[PDB]
Design a binder for this molecule. Structure first.
Ligand SMILES: OC[C@H]1O[C@H](O[C@H]2[C@H](O)[C@@H](O)[C@H](OCCCCCCC3CCCCC3)O[C@@H]2CO)[C@H](O)[C@@H](O)[C@@H]1O
Lengths: 50, 50
């Protein structure tokens, strides 16, 4: 039984490091943080006796 | 009485430095003089403790 579906948003800063190689000889690891507003829809149900 | 102490320490560190300097100067006999020098530095550090 569909109880309720709602969407939830939250801002999070994800830090990630990547190894960029330009010209296959200039290789450096750059760490960057991205602030993203992650949004997810949750749909909660419940089981009733048929 | 029993005591157990366990300590683990990990340190990691990386430094990457690249330097490029490209110069080009053409000089005719006191008619045209053209000099172009480009520089590039890239210094990155990354330390991770635990
Ligand atoms: O910083 C900005 C945000 O800070 C909080 O939210 C924090 C949250 O309380 C925390 O748990 C996590 O930060 C830490 C980031 C965790 C994910 C990356 C972890 C990395 C660590 C290094 C190795 C790779 C993974 O998310 C956000 C950060 O925006 C609040 O939502 C609010 O103040 C604001 O919106």
């Amino acid at each position: 039984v569909h109880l309720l579906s709602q969407t939830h948003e939250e801002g999070y800063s994800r830090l990630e490091c990547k190894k960029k190689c330009t010209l296959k000889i200039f290789c450096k690891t750059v760490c960057e943080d991205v602030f993203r507003v992650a949004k997810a829809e949750f749909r909660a149900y419940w089981c009733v006796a048929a | 009485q029993e005591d157990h102490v366990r300590s683990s320490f990990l340190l990691d560190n990386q430094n990457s430095q690249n330097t490029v300097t490209a110069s080009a100067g053409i000089a005719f006999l006191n008619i045209v003089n053209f000099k172009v020098e480009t520089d590039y530095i890239s210094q990155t550090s990354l330390t991770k403790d635990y």
